[PDB]
Design a protein around this ligand. Structure first.
Ligand SMILES: CCCCCCCCCCCCCCCCCC(=O)OC[C@H](COP(=O)([O-])OCC(O)COP(=O)([O-])OC[C@@H](COC(=O)CCCCCCCCCCCCCCCCC)OC(=O)CCCCCCCCCCCCCCCCC)OC(=O)CCCCCCCCCCCCCCCCC
Ligand SMILES: CCCCCCCCCCCCCCCCCC(=O)OC[C@H](COP(=O)([O-])OCC(O)COP(=O)([O-])OC[C@@H](COC(=O)CCCCCCCCCCCCCCCCC)OC(=O)CCCCCCCCCCCCCCCCC)OC(=O)CCCCCCCCCCCCCCCCC
Ligand SMILES: CCCCCCCCCCCCCCCCCC(=O)OC[C@H](COP(=O)([O-])OCC(O)COP(=O)([O-])OC[C@@H](COC(=O)CCCCCCCCCCCCCCCCC)OC(=O)CCCCCCCCCCCCCCCCC)OC(=O)CCCCCCCCCCCCCCCCC
Ligand SMILES: CCCCCCCCCCCCCCCCCC(=O)OC[C@H](COP(=O)([O-])OCC(O)COP(=O)([O-])OC[C@@H](COC(=O)CCCCCCCCCCCCCCCCC)OC(=O)CCCCCCCCCCCCCCCCC)OC(=O)CCCCCCCCCCCCCCCCC
Ligand SMILES: CCCCCCCCCCCCCCCCCC(=O)OC[C@H](COP(=O)([O-])OCC(O)COP(=O)([O-])OC[C@@H](COC(=O)CCCCCCCCCCCCCCCCC)OC(=O)CCCCCCCCCCCCCCCCC)OC(=O)CCCCCCCCCCCCCCCCC
Ligand SMILES: CCCCCCCCCCCCCCCCCC(=O)OC[C@H](COP(=O)([O-])OCC[N+](C)(C)C)OC(=O)CCCCCCCCCCCCCCCCC
Ligand SMILES: CCCCCCCCCCCCCCCCCC(=O)OC[C@H](COP(=O)(O)OCCN)OC(=O)CCCCCCCCCCCCCCCCC
Ligand code: SF4
Ligand code: F3S
Ligand code: FES
Ligand SMILES: [Ca+2]
Lengths: 196, 74, 59, 93, 44, 103, 70, 43, 285, 62
C-alpha cells in the first residue's frame, strides 16, 4: 500500500514535529492576553501556531495503520496525538475566555462611545436598563468564572487582570447612584478593592 | 513623531523552509510556462488576422425570438 | 446611573510648541497620503462620468 | 533565557471543563460592527481594484460586437437588416 | 504602511476598536491578494 | 427601547447567533473552513520569495540558496526576450505570407 | 468643418430627412468640440515620452478611444 | 541576522509600490481635454 | 414602561451641542453684589464646579474676586483661601503642601501641574482659570478619578524581583555609584499623572496604552541593576500598544513639574524593545 | 444641556489649528506635485502646445 505508506509517513512527520513545538506555542498563548491570544503569532512570528491548529484535527480524526509503525515509534505517535488533543482543548478554552473578554470590551466600548467628546449626536445623561442588565449579567458570569477557576491560581490571576480591567473601567464610567449598588453588588465584594 | 518608513523586508515573512530556501525556482518555472502559453496564444490570435469585406461576410439579421429583423417606416 | 463626564484637555490646554511640532509632521504625512488617495479617487470619478448628450434628448 | 515558569505551568495545567456562556446580543453586535467596518470601508478599496481596470481598459471585457447593414423595402415600407459578427478592436487611434 | 494605516485608524476612531487582530490580519491578507491581482491584471 | 421591540430584537439576534454558530460548526462546513484557513495561511505566509534570513554558515548553505535570485532573474529575462523575438518573427512571417499571397 | 445650423432639406417632401439633418447640424458644433478635445488629448499622450507616453499609448488609452468612437 | 538579497528585496518593494501607484493614480497618463481650449491650432 | 427614544436623544444631543457652543464657558459670579471699583483691586478666579451627586447640578465656572495680598502666591493657596473664606464646599486633594505627594495635580491656568508649587499671574486684569485634569473623569469640582492610573501602575509589577539568591543574607545588593546615578533623576516621580493627562496618546487610548509615568516607572525598574527580570519586563511592556502607541510628543517632559524626562525614558524603552525583538532572533540560533 | 469649556483663541484646537494645519497639510503636495506636475505637462510639449487639427476647422460650409 504505497498510498497508505505515504499517508502514515506524512501524519507521523507532521504530528511529531508539531508535538515538539506545542509546549512553546501554548506558553506563548498563555503569555499573550485575551484580547488577541494569537497576537504574537499574527504579528511577530508564527511559531508553528497555524500548523498546530491545522494538524490537531488531523491527529484527532485521521486513522492510523499500526503495521506501518514501530513499538517506540507508535508510543511516540500516541504521545504526540495526546499532546495535540491537549493543545486543541487549551485553544478552545483560550478562545472561550477571549470571547468573554471581548463581550466585556464591547460593553465598555458602548459606554465609551456614549461619553466620547465627538459624540455630539448620541449624548445620553442616564444609563439605560438594557445596558445596565447586560453589565449585571456579564459581571455575574465573570464572578462565576472566577469561582470556577479556584483550583488554578495563575489562571484566576490572569483572568482577573485581563477581563476585570474593563469591569473596573465600567465601574468608573458611571456615578454611584440609581441602581449602581445592585448592579455592582458582586463586583464590590473583592473585585472593586483589587482595582484601586 | 516617530520615523517608520523603510524599504527593508519584514522578519515575519523572511523565514526559510526546512529543506532550504523558499520554493522560488519551481514557482518561477511555473510562471514562465504560464506566461509562455498566454503570450503564445495572444501572439497567434493577434498576428494572423485579416479583414475581408464582401457580400458573403453579411448574414440576415434576426431578433432574439429568431424571426427576421424588419422595422416598419412608421 | 448618571454617566460621568470630563473636559477634553486640548480644549483647555495652552498651545505648546511640542504639539505643533509633532502634529506638523503628522499632518504632513496625512496630507501626502490623502492627496494621493484623493487624486486616485478623482481620476476614478471623472473617468466614470457619462458622455455629453444632445439637447432635449430622451434615452 | 526568559523566566517563563508560570506561563509553562499554566500551559501544562489548564481546566478542561470550564466554559462561559456568551451574550448572543453582544456577540452579534461586535460581529456586525466588524461587518460594517468591512463592507463600508474595505469594499471601497476592493471595488476600486476590481473596477478601475475595467474602466481604464474596457475593450478587453467585450471581445465580440455586431455590425449592421440596412436596405430599403419600398413596396412594404420596411427596413431589412443584415448583421455581422466582428472582433471588438480599437479604431481611429 | 498598512500597519501604520490600521494603527492610525484604531487609535483615532473609537468604533474601529471592535475589530480583532484576527480581523485586521484577514483584511491584510485580502488587501495583499487584491494588490497582487491588480499588479498582474494591469499588465494583461 | 419598547419591551415588545426588545423581545423582537432579542429573538432576531439569537436567531443570527444560532445561524452563524450552526454554519460555522457544521461538520462539512467546519472541515471546509479549517482546511481553507490552513491553505490561506500557507499561501500568505509561505509564498515564493527571493530574500530570507540566512541562519546557516557558508559551509552549511547550499549553492541554490545563493544563486536562486540570479536563476530567477535569468529565467524571467530570457522568457521576456524570447517572447519579444517570437513576436518579431511572427510579424515577419505574417507579412511575408500575406505579401506572397497577394500584393 | 463648421456646418451651418439651417438645414437645406425640404420639410414638405422629406420631413424625417429634414428633421434628422436639422438635429445633426444643431448638435454638430458641440460634438465636434468634444471630438477635437479627445483627439488633442490622444495625440499629446502619444507625444509623451517613455512611460509618460509612446511606450504605452495605444494599449492603455482605451477609454479615450471608446469615447472618441461614441 | 544576515538577510539574503536584502538589496534585491528593497528594490522589488520599491518597484512594486511605484508600479501600484502608477497604475492607481495614472499620474504619468494625464488628461488634456481641459487644456484643449488653451492650445493653438495648425493647418 | 419605556419606548424607543433614538430620535428624541439625537435631537436633544444636537440642540445641546449647538447651545453649548453658543454659551461656552458658562460663568456664574459668586458674589454679584460687587462694585467694579472694588473689582479693580481684586483678581478674578474662574473655578470649575460640578457635583454629579446632585441631579440638579451641571458643570460651570464660578467667578471669585479675591485680594491676592492675603495669602502666599500659589494656586493651592488661592484655592484654599477661596474654600475657607468664600465657599467651603469646594473639593480638592492636598496632602504635602510642598510638591511631594502630587495629589494637587490640576489644570492650573491651561497647564497641568501641582497647584502647591505653581504661581499664578499677578496681573489683576487677566483672569485665572482653575479646572481639573482634562481627560480624567470628574468626581466633584477639582477631584478626578485616578483609579485607572493606579491599576495601570499596578500592572507593571513595581517591585524588585531577583532570580539569584543573596550570597550571604547579611549584606546589601551591591550597586556602584554609577549604577545609582543611572537611577538618579528617574525615581523622583510622584505619580501626579499630569504628564499622562497631557499626553495625546493617553487621551486617545487610556487603557490599551500605558501612561508615560507608568512606562517611566517600568524603565526605572528595568535599568535598575539589582533586578534580574530585565528581559521579562521588556517583553511584558512590548505587548500590543502598551508602549508602541507613544509618538514622542515630549509634552510629558515639558509638563513634568519635577523636571524629569519621561520622553527620554520612553525613547530608551523603545530602543531596548527594538533591540530585544531583533536579538530574540539573532541570539537564539 | 451639554456645557462645553473651551478656550477658542488659546487652546491647541482653534486659531492655532487654523494657522498650523493649512501650511502643514500642503507641504508635500505643493513641493512634490507642482514640480512633478510641471515636468509631466511640459515633457510632452517639447516643441509647443500645438493641436494638430485632424479635422477641417478652417473650412466653413458656403
Ligand atoms: C498550478 C496549477 C494548479 C493549482 C492547484 C491548487 C490547489 C489548491 C487546493 C487547496 C486545498 C486545501 C489545502 C489544505 C492543506 C493541505 C496540504 C498541507 O497541509 O500542506 C502539505 C504541504 C506541506 O505542508 P506542511 O508540512 O504543513 O509545511 C508547512 C509547515 O510550515 C512546515 O514547513 P517546513 O519548513 O517544514 O517546510 C515544508 C515545505 C514543504 O513544501 C513542499 O513540499 C511543497 C513545495 C512546492 C511544490 C513541490 C512539488 C512540485 C511538483 C508537483 C507535481 C504535482 C503534479 C500533479 C499531477 C496531477 C495530475 C492529475 O512547506 C512549504 O514551504 C509550503 C509551501 C507553500 C506554498 C504556497 C504557495 C502560495 C502562492 C501560490 C500562487 C502563486 C502565484 C504567483 C503569481 C505571480 C505572477 C507575477 O504543503 C503543501 O502542499 C503546500 C500547498 C500550498 C498551496 C495551496 C494553496 C494554493 C492556492 C493557489 C491560489 C488559488 C486562488 C484561486 C481563487 C480562489 C477560489 C478558487
Ligand atoms: C466647506 C464647504 C466647501 C465646499 C466645496 C465645494 C467644491 C465644489 C467643486 C465642484 C467640482 C470641481 C471639479 C474641478 C476639477 C478640476 C479638473 C478639471 O478641470 O478637469 C476637467 C474635468 C475632467 O478632469 P480630468 O482631466 O478627467 O481629471 C481631473 C483630475 O483632477 C485630474 O486632474 P489633474 O491631474 O490635472 O489634477 C491637477 C493636479 C494638481 O495637483 C497639484 O499639483 C496640487 C497643487 C495644489 C496647490 C495649492 C496651493 C495653495 C496655497 C496654500 C498657502 C498656505 C499658506 C499658509 C500660511 C500660514 C502662515 C505661515 O491634481 C490636483 O489638482 C489634485 C486633486 C486631488 C485632490 C486631493 C484632495 C481630495 C480630498 C479633499 C477635498 C477638499 C476638502 C476640503 C474640506 C474643507 C473643510 C473646511 O472635466 C471637466 O471639464 C469638468 C469640470 C469640473 C466641473 C465638474 C462638475 C461635476 C458636477 C458633479 C455633481 C455634484 C456637484 C456638487 C457641487 C457642490 C458644491 C457645493
Ligand atoms: C459621490 C460618491 C459617493 C460618496 C459616498 C460614499 C460612501 C461609501 C460608504 C460609506 C460607509 C461609511 C460607514 C462605515 C464606516 C464606519 C462608521 C462607523 O464606525 O460607524 C459608527 C459611527 C457612529 O458612531 P456613534 O456611536 O453613533 O458616534 C459616537 C462615537 O463616539 C463615534 O466614534 P467614532 O470616532 O468611531 O466615529 C467617527 C465617525 C464619524 O461620526 C461622528 O462622530 C460624526 C459624523 C458626522 C460629522 C458631521 C460634521 C460635524 C462638524 C465638523 C466640522 C464641519 C464643518 C463644515 C463647514 C465648513 C465651512 C468652512 O467616523 C466615521 O464615520 C468613519 C468613516 C467616515 C468616512 C466614510 C463615510 C463618508 C460619507 C460621506 C458622505 C456623507 C453624506 C453626505 C453629507 C453631505 C450632505 C450635504 O459611524 C456611523 O455610524 C456614521 C457613519 C457616517 C455617516 C455620515 C456622516 C458624514 C461624514 C462626512 C465625512 C466627510 C469626509 C470628506 C470626504 C467625503 C467625500 C465623499
Ligand atoms: C475551481 C478551482 C478549484 C481548485 C483550486 C482551489 C484554490 C483555492 C483553495 C481551496 C481551499 C478549500 C478547499 C475545500 C475544502 C476541502 C475540505 C475537504 O476535503 O473535506 C474533507 C473533510 C473530511 O476529512 P476530515 O474530517 O478532515 O478527516 C477525517 C475523515 O474521516 C477522513 O478520514 P480519512 O483518513 O479516511 O481521509 C483523509 C484524507 C484521505 O486520505 C488519504 O486517502 C490519503 C490522502 C493523502 C495524504 C497525504 C500524502 C502526501 C504524499 C506526498 C505527495 C507528494 C507529491 C509530489 C510532491 C513532492 C515534493 C514536495 O481525506 C481527506 O480528508 C482529504 C482532504 C484533502 C486532501 C488532504 C491531503 C493534502 C496533502 C496532499 C495533497 C497536496 C499535495 C502535497 C504535496 C507535498 C507534500 C509534502 O471534510 C469533509 O468531509 C467535507 C466534505 C465537503 C466539502 C467538499 C469536499 C471536496 C473534496 C475534495 C477532495 C480532494 C482530494 C485531493 C485531490 C488531489 C488531486 C490532485
Ligand atoms: C480558499 C483559499 C483561501 C482564500 C483566501 C482569500 C484570498 C485569496 C488567497 C489565495 C492564495 C493566493 C494569494 C496570492 C499570494 C499572496 C502573497 C502575499 O500576500 O505575500 C505577502 C508577502 C509580503 O511580504 P513582505 O515582507 O512585504 O515582502 C514583500 C517584498 O516585496 C519582498 O518581495 P521579494 O523580494 O521576495 O520579491 C518577490 C519575488 C517572488 O518571485 C517569485 O519567485 C515568483 C515568480 C513568478 C512565478 C509565477 C508562478 C505562477 C504560477 C501559475 C500557474 C497557473 C495557476 C492556475 C490556477 C487555476 C486554478 C486551479 O519576486 C522576484 O523574485 C522578483 C522578480 C523580478 C524579475 C526582474 C526581471 C528583470 C529582467 C532583466 C534581466 C537582466 C537584464 C540585464 C540587461 C543588461 C543591459 C545593459 O509576500 C512575500 O513575502 C512573497 C512575495 C510576493 C509574492 C506575490 C504573489 C502574488 C500571487 C497572486 C496570484 C493571483 C492569482 C489569481 C488567480 C485567479 C484565477 C481565477
Ligand atoms: C461630502 C461630505 C463632506 C462633509 C465634510 C465634513 C468635514 C468633517 C471634518 C471633521 C474633522 C475632525 C473632527 C471630527 C471627527 C473627529 C474624530 C476623532 O477621532 O475625534 C475623536 C476625539 C474626541 O474624542 P475624545 O477626545 O473623547 O477621545 C476619545 C477618548 N475616549 C476613548 C476615552 C472616549 O476628537 C474630536 O472629536 C475632536 C473634535 C474637535 C472639534 C473642533 C471643531 C472646530 C470647529 C471650527 C469651526 C470654524 C467656523 C469658522 C466660521 C468663519 C465665518 C467667517
Ligand atoms: C475622508 C473619508 C471619506 C472618503 C470617501 C471616499 C469615497 C470613494 C468613492 C469611490 C467611488 C466613486 C463613485 C463616483 C460616482 C459619482 C456619481 C455622480 O454623482 O456622478 C455625477 C452625476 C452627473 O454626472 P454625469 O451624468 O456624468 O453628467 C456630467 C457629464 N459631463 O450626478 C448625478 O447624476 C446626480 C444624481 C446621482 C447622485 C445622487 C446622490 C444622492 C446623495 C444622497 C445623500 C443622502 C444622505 C444625506 C445626509 C445629510 C442630510 C441632511
Ligand atoms: S513623570 Fe513627572 S509629571 Fe509624570 S507623574 Fe511623574 S512627577 Fe508627575
Ligand atoms: S507626552 Fe505622550 S506619546 Fe510619548 S514622549 Fe511624552 S509620552
Ligand atoms: S500639596 Fe502635595 S503635591 Fe501639591
Ligand atoms: Ca535590569
Amino acid at each position: 500500500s504505497l498510498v497508505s505508506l505515504f499517508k502514515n509517513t506524512f501524519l507521523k512527520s507532521r504530528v511529531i514535529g508539531l508535538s515538539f513545538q506545542a509546549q512553546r506555542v501554548m506558553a506563548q498563548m498563555a503569555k499573550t492576553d485575551f484580547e488577541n491570544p494569537d497576537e504574537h503569532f499574527l504579528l511577530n512570528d508564527a511559531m508553528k501556531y497555524n500548523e498546530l491548529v491545522f494538524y490537531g484535527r488531523l491527529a484527532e480524526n485521521w486513522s492510523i495503520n499500526p503495521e506501518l509503525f514501530g513499538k517506540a515509534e507508535l508510543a511516540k505517535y500516541n504521545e504526540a496525538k495526546q499532546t495535540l488533543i491537549d493543545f486543541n482543548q487549551y485553544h478552545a478554552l483560550v478562545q472561550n475566555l477571549h470571547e468573554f473578554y471581548w463581550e466585556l470590551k464591547t460593553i465598555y466600548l458602548e459606554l465609551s462611545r456614549g461619553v466620547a467628546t465627538s459624540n455630539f449626536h448620541n449624548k445620553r445623561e442616564v444609563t439605560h436598563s438594557i445596558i445596565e442588565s447586560d453589565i449585571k449579567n456579564s459581571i455575574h458570569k465573570y464572578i462565576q468564572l472566577i469561582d470556577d477557576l479556584k483550583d488554578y491560581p495563575e489562571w484566576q490571576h490572569k483572568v482577573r487582570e485581563e477581563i476585570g480591567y474593563y469591569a473596573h473601567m465600567i465601574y468608573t464610567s458611571v456615578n454611584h447612584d440609581g441602581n449602581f449598588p445592585e448592579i455592582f453588588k458582586e463586583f464590590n465584594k473583592v473585585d472593586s478593592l483589587y482595582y484601586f | 513623531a516617530r520615523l517608520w518608513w523603510t524599504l527593508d523586508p519584514s522578519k515575519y515573512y523572511l523565514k526559510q523552509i526546512s529543506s532550504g530556501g523558499r520554493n522560488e525556482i519551481l514557482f518561477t518555472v511555473l510562471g514562465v510556462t504560464a506566461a509562455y502559453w498566454y503570450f503564445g496564444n495572444k501572439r497567434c490570435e493577434h498576428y494572423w488576422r485579416r479583414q475581408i469585406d464582401n457580400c458573403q461576410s453579411w448574414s440576415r439579421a434576426q431578433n432574439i425570438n429568431g424571426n427576421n429583423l424588419t422595422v416598419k417606416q412608421y | 446611573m448618571r454617566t460621568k463626564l470630563y473636559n477634553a484637555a486640548y480644549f483647555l490646554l495652552n498651545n505648546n510648541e511640542s504639539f505643533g511640532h509633532s502634529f506638523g509632521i503628522r499632518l504632513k504625512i496625512v496630507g501626502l497620503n490623502t492627496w494621493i488617495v484623493g487624486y486616485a479617487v478623482s481620476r476614478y470619478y471623472f473617468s466614470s462620468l457619462r458622455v455629453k448628450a444632445a439637447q432635449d434628448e430622451r434615452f | 533565557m526568559l523566566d517563563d515558569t508560570k506561563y509553562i505551568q499554566m500551559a501544562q495545567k489548564f481546566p478542561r471543563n470550564v466554559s462561559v456562556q456568551l451574550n448572543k446580543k453582544l456577540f452579534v453586535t461586535r460581529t456586525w460592527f466588524r461587518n460594517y467596518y468591512f463592507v463600508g470601508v474595505f469594499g471601497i478599496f476592493a471595488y476600486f481594484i476590481y473596477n478601475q481596470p475595467k474602466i481604464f481598459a474596457p475593450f478587453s471585457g467585450y471581445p465580440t460586437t455586431v455590425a449592421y447593414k440596412a436596405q430599403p423595402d419600398f413596396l412594404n415600407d420596411q427596413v431589412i437588416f443584415y448583421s455581422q459578427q466582428r472582433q471588438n478592436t480599437l479604431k481611429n487611434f | 504602511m498598512f500597519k501604520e494605516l490600521i494603527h492610525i485608524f484604531r487609535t483615532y476612531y473609537i468604533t474601529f476598536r471592535y475589530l480583532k487582530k484576527s480581523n485586521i490580519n484577514f483584511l491584510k491578507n485580502l488587501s495583499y491578494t487584491l494588490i497582487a491581482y491588480y499588479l498582474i491584471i494591469n499588465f494583461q | 427601547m419598547n419591551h415588545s421591540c426588545q423581545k423582537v430584537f432579542e429573538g432576531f439576534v439569537s436567531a443570527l447567533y444560532d445561524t452563524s454558530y450552526f454554519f460555522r460548526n457544521f461538520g462539512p462546513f467546519k472541515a471546509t473552513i479549517h482546511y481553507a484557513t490552513y491553505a490561506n495561511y500557507l499561501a500568505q505566509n509561505w509564498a515564493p520569495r527571493v530574500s530570507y534570513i540566512e541562519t546557516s554558515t557558508p559551509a552549511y548553505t547550499l549553492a541554490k540558496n545563493k544563486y536562486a535570485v540570479y536563476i530567477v532573474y535569468g529565467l524571467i529575462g530570457g522568457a521576456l526576450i524570447h517572447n519579444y523575438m517570437l513576436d518579431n518573427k511572427a510579424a515577419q512571417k505574417s507579412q511575408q505570407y500575406y505579401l506572397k499571397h497577394r500584393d | 468643418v463648421r456646418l451651418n445650423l439651417k438645414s437645406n432639406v425640404d420639410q414638405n417632401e422629406y420631413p424625417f430627412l429634414a428633421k434628422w439633418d436639422k438635429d445633426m447640424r444643431q448638435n454638430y458644433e458641440e460634438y465636434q468640440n468634444r471630438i477635437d478635445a479627445t483627439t488633442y488629448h490622444l495625440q499629446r499622450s502619444q507625444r509623451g515620452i517613455a512611460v509618460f507616453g509612446e511606450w504605452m499609448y495605444p494599449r492603455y488609452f482605451q477609454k479615450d478611444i471608446l469615447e472618441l468612437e461614441v | 541576522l544576515p538577510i539574503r538579497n536584502i538589496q534585491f528585496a528593497r528594490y522589488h518593494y520599491l518597484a512594486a509600490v511605484t508600479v501600484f501607484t502608477y497604475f492607481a493614480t495614472r499620474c504619468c497618463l494625464l488628461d488634456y481635454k481641459k487644456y484643449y481650449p488653451l492650445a493653438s491650432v495648425k493647418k | 414602561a419605556e419606548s424607543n427614544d433614538a430620535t428624541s436623544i439625537c435631537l436633544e444631543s444636537i440642540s445641546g451641542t449647538i447651545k453649548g457652543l453658543q454659551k461656552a464657558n458658562y460663568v456664574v459670579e459668586h458674589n454679584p453684589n460687587l462694585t467694579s471699583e472694588e473689582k479693580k483691586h481684586l483678581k478674578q478666579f474662574l473655578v470649575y464646579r460640578y457635583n454629579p451627586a446632585d441631579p440638579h447640578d451641571q458643570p460651570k465656572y464660578v467667578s471669585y474676586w479675591c485680594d491676592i495680598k492675603k495669602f502666599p502666591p500659589m494656586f493651592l493657596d488661592a484655592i484654599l483661601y477661596i474654600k475657607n473664606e468664600l465657599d467651603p464646599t469646594l473639593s480638592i486633594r492636598r496632602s504635602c503642601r510642598e510638591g511631594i505627594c502630587g495629589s494637587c495635580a490640576v489644570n492650573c491656568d491651561g497647564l497641568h501641574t501641582l497647584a502647591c508649587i505653581s504661581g499664578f499671574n499677578r496681573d489683576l486684569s487677566k483672569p485665572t482659570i482653575i479646572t481639573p485634569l482634562g481627560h480624567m473623569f470628574i468626581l466633584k469640582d477639582l477631584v478626578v478619578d485616578m483609579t485607572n492610573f493606579y491599576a495601570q501602575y499596578k500592572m507593571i509589577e513595581p517591585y524588585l524581583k531577583r532570580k539569584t539568591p543573596k550570597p550571604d543574607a547579611n549584606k546589601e545588593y551591591p550597586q556602584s555609584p554609577e549604577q545609582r546615578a543611572l537611577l538618579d533623576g528617574l525615581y523622583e516621580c510622584v505619580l501626579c499623572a499630569a504628564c499622562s493627562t497631557s499626553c495625546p496618546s493617553y487621551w486617545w487610548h487610556p487603557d490599551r496604552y500605558l501612561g508615560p509615568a507608568i512606562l517611566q516607572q517600568a524603565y526605572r525598574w528595568i535599568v535598575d541593576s539589582r533586578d534580574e527580570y530585565t528581559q521579562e519586563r521588556i517583553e511584558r511592556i512590548a505587548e500590543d500598544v502598551r508602549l508602541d502607541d507613544c509618538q514622542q510628543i515630549g509634552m510629558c517632559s515639558f509638563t513634568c513639574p519635577k523636571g524629569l524626562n519621561p520622553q527620554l525614558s520612553l525613547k530608551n524603552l523603545m530602543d531596548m524593545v527594538k533591540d530585544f525583538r531583533q536579538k530574540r532572533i539573532e541570539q537564539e540560533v | 444641556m451639554r456645557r462645553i469649556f473651551w478656550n477658542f483663541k488659546t487652546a491647541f484646537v482653534g486659531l492655532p489649528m487654523f494657522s498650523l494645519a493649512p501650511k502643514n497639510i500642503l507641504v508635500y503636495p505643493i513641493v512634490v506635485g507642482v514640480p512633478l506636475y510641471t515636468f509631466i505637462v511640459l515633457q510632452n510639449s517639447v516643441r509647443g502646445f500645438a493641436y494638430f487639427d485632424e479635422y477641417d476647422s478652417d473650412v466653413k460650409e458656403n
